[PDB]
Design a protein around this motif. Structure first.
Motif, PDB file in Angstrom:
ATOM      1  N   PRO A  57       0.771  -1.241   0.000  1.00 18.88           N
ATOM      2  CA  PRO A  57       0.000   0.000   0.000  1.00 18.88           C
ATOM      3  C   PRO A  57       0.805   1.297   0.000  1.00 18.88           C
ATOM      4  CG  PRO A  57       0.080  -0.919   2.203  1.00 18.88           C
ATOM      5  CD  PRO A  57       0.885  -1.842   1.342  1.00 18.88           C
ATOM      6  N   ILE A  63      -3.990  -1.383   4.629  1.00 20.58           N
ATOM      7  CA  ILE A  63      -5.067  -1.853   3.779  1.00 20.58           C
ATOM      8  C   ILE A  63      -6.344  -1.845   4.608  1.00 20.58           C
ATOM      9  CG2 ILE A  63      -3.430  -3.117   2.342  1.00 20.58           C
ATOM     10  CD1 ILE A  63      -4.721  -5.736   3.492  1.00 20.58           C
ATOM     11  N   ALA A 159      -7.219  -5.381  -2.866  1.00 23.01           N
ATOM     12  CA  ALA A 159      -7.142  -4.685  -1.591  1.00 23.01           C
ATOM     13  C   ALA A 159      -7.107  -3.184  -1.838  1.00 23.01           C
ATOM     14  CB  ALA A 159      -5.909  -5.108  -0.845  1.00 23.01           C
ATOM     15  N   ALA A 161      -6.812   0.828   0.249  1.00 26.44           N
ATOM     16  CA  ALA A 161      -6.181   1.488   1.397  1.00 26.44           C
ATOM     17  C   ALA A 161      -6.692   2.924   1.552  1.00 26.44           C
ATOM     18  CB  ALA A 161      -4.676   1.482   1.257  1.00 26.44           C
TER      19      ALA A 161
END
Ligand SMILES: [Ca+2]
Length: 161
Positions: A57, A63, A159, A161
């Motif tokens: 990230p 995340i 994912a 963030a």
């Protein structure tokens, strides 16, 4: 801020490459038309099925969520009961090395749908680069009320963030 995270180092419990071209890589290619699929050609894999990868990230972020998009072509027993595990990327050399994933940091039951599912994660998970395991414990049947299928398929896993 609701943005996507670099994924890499993909792994899967199993994958189908014989009956069709459905490797783990298909789940991370930013194409809804391609999917990973569990190995159903003989010898076929059984539940649970999972995908894992590295999320990167940036240094000063964490995340916030895992997203799951089913295949978009038909309803073929999508995932029902799922679990997300997370560990720090330092925990091992690669995803495949990780021997202890800890307790699921999150669970979810998905509706009977092809639509995108979001699983928010707790802020108790490590900051920065993490290994993520998305695990499918249970699946829907070919209708809501028929017996759950033994296979799994994911068009995209990501994912934020
Ligand atoms: Ca895909």
């Amino acid at each position: 801020l609701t943005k996507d995270v670099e994924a890499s180092d993909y792994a899967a419990s199993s994958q189908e490459t014989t009956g069709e071209h459905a490797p783990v890589g298909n789940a991370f290619d930013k194409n809804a038309n391609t999917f990973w699929h569990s190995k159903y050609s003989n010898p076929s894999a059984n539940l649970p099925h999972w995908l894992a990868f590295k999320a990167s990230p940036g240094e000063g972020n964490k995340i916030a969520a895992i997203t799951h998009l089913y295949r978009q072509d038909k309803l073929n027993g999508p995932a029902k009961n799922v679990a997300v595990y997370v560990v720090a990327a330092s925990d091992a050399n690669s995803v495949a090395d990780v021997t202890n994933w800890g307790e699921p940091v999150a669970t979810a039951e998905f509706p009977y749908t092809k639509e995108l599912q979001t699983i928010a994660l707790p802020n108790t998970i490590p900051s920065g680069d993490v290994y993520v395991k998305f695990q499918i414990n249970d699946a829907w049947g070919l209708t809501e009320t028929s017996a759950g299928v033994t296979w799994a398929a994911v068009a995209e896993l990501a994912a934020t963030a």
